[PDB]
């Protein structure tokens, strides 16, 4: 069944160290009959940016959500979406498509002095790269600052204060590929978490404690020349592209936050208990200028009742897979470890999105005789929209935890018996 895109308004924004494009597609069906009811939507991706993808979500006019699955065709990893109501010929449906590309803004000078500003370059597409011929496409680009240097001209693109409009293209080919490149000033915090490890230890006695190790590096515009604390302090201009602090958002039940490094405590942080969450501003030991790869550890423990449900002999816990670290984050490697207690017999895990998973192993903390099972899940290219809830179901005999006191007892008893024999 042939599909026609009628109106496509694409608004891209490039202010962050990220590229988010939202296309408001309007689809219509052709007048020809013997097509019945079309129920599938096809999405495409250009080969330039097919690997630098983090999330692709599709909604409908109003408040709604839809389901897309990856498909292969005989190549740009085409996706297909299942519409809620199948559209008959002559109908029209509005579908909002939002995608997020990571590691796509490259710093062009690539070396900036302690008293200069960042200039980045973006290479995307002019037209809506779809497998359907569209009719009216208009693109609006949102920048960080009003210091553009070279933007490709196609249709006399007018320029507003910080937003660039492109003339509506009357019609486009079957595959409407084109190269669009902007060179602008983006002195925003560029930050990449290289590898974050989240460890979640569950305890039926009290609460559950989650700690995460964070390697993070300032990617763009590496620093050349000398660094001087004097100029950094007595001149607020210099140091624009650097970072000083970032705030984490905690789930409002956190109780023991510590923020330790690999070498000791760090006394530079500020946590405020808010009504709905726990905000925590964090300063690293030193400001980051270019590729400075700070590494820290943040952990806390929260009440068990809030994230643990028990019925009969079954327990089920739901928690955030990846939790907030800073505004508009990006991860390159993420390993979740869920440390269940000893008698976790039937462990099933419901993943919201496809997560690469390794084999289970055993962990030996203090009062363990035969160890406790751990669940490991490896994922890559995580963004702020990957914050979901993962639930694990396991059966656990209630009597069995009593083996933890008794163990201690037996040790004591042995000592006394030894005395007796002596």
């Amino acid at each position: 069944p042939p599909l026609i895109n009628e109106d496509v308004k694409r608004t891209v924004d490039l202010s962050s160290h990220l590229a988010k494009v939202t296309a408001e597609v309007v689809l219509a069906h052709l007048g020809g009959g013997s097509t019945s009811r079309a129920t599938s939507f096809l999405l495409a991706l250009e080969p330039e940016l097919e690997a630098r993808l983090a999330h692709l979500g599709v909604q409908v006019k109003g408040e709604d959500e839809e389901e897309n699955n990856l498909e292969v065709r005989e190549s740009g990893r085409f996706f297909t979406v299942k519409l809620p109501v199948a559209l008959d010929p002559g109908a029209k449906i509005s579908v909002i498509v939002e995608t997020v590309y990571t590691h796509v803004l490259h710093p062009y000078p690539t070396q900036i002095t302690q008293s200069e500003k960042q200039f980045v370059v973006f290479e995307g597409n002019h037209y809506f790269y779809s497998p359907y011929p569209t009719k009216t496409q208009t693109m609006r680009v949102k920048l960080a600052s009003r210091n553009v240097e070279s933007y490709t001209k196609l249709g006399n693109p007018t320029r507003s204060e910080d937003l660039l409009d492109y003339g509506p293209f009357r019609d486009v080919p079957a595959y409407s590929q084109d190269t669009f490149k902007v060179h602008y000033e983006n002195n925003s915090p560029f930050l990449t978490i290289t590898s974050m490890t989240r460890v979640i230890e569950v305890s039926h006695w009290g609460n559950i404690a989650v700690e995460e190790n964070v390697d993070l590096k300032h990617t763009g515009a590496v620093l050349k020349g000398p660094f001087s604390r004097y100029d950094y302090q007595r001149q607020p201009d210099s140091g624009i592209s650097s970072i000083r602090s970032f705030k984490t958002i905690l789930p409002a039940a956190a109780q023991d936050v510590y923020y330790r490094d690999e070498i000791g405590n760090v006394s530079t942080s500020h946590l405020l208990i808010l009504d709905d969450s726990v905000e925590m501003e964090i300063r690293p030991r030193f400001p980051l200028f270019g590729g400075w790869k700070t590494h820290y550890i943040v952990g806390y423990n929260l009440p068990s009742y809030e994230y643990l449900y028990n019925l009969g002999d079954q327990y089920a816990l739901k928690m955030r897979f990846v939790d907030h670290v800073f505004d508009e984050q990006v991860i390159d490697s993420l390993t979740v470890k869920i440390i269940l207690p000893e008698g976790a017999k039937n462990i099933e895990i419901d993943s919201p999105y496809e997560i690469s998973r390794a084999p289970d192993e055993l962990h030996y903390t203090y009062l363990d005789t035969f160890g406790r099972p751990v669940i490991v899940a490896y994922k890559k290219n995580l963004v702020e929209q990957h914050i979901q809830d993962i639930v694990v179901h396991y059966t656990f005999n209630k009597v069995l935890m009593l083996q933890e006191p008794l163990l201690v007892v037996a040790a004591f008893y042995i000592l006394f018996f030894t005395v007796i024999i002596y």
Binding site: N207, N310, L311, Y366, P405, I420
Partner: protein, 78 residues
């Protein structure tokens, strides 16, 4: 599902962990002391194996529970 499952409240109100830690230790420690005293004062002709076994078992039990509640009180939550 997830709707018909009750919240998992702890079996022992955490506010009772401190009160339970001292007592269980104290009693335990007391018995322990007794045992050791008994092993230094009593000669070979004045030792009863059943009394020693009884007092040692009581001390071991109370001490194990007290040590658990203390170890959990500091926040290890074993």
């Amino acid at each position: 599902e997830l709707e018909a499952m009750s919240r998992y409240t702890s079996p022992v109100n955490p506010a009772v962990f401190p009160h339970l830690t001292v007592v269980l230790l104290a009693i335990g420690m007391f018995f322990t002391a007794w045992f050791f005293v008994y092993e230094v004062t009593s000669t070979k002709y004045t030792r009863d194996i059943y009394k020693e076994l009884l007092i040692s078992l009581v001390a071991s039990l109370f001490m194990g529970f007290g040590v658990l509640f203390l170890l959990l009180w500091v926040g290890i939550y074993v």
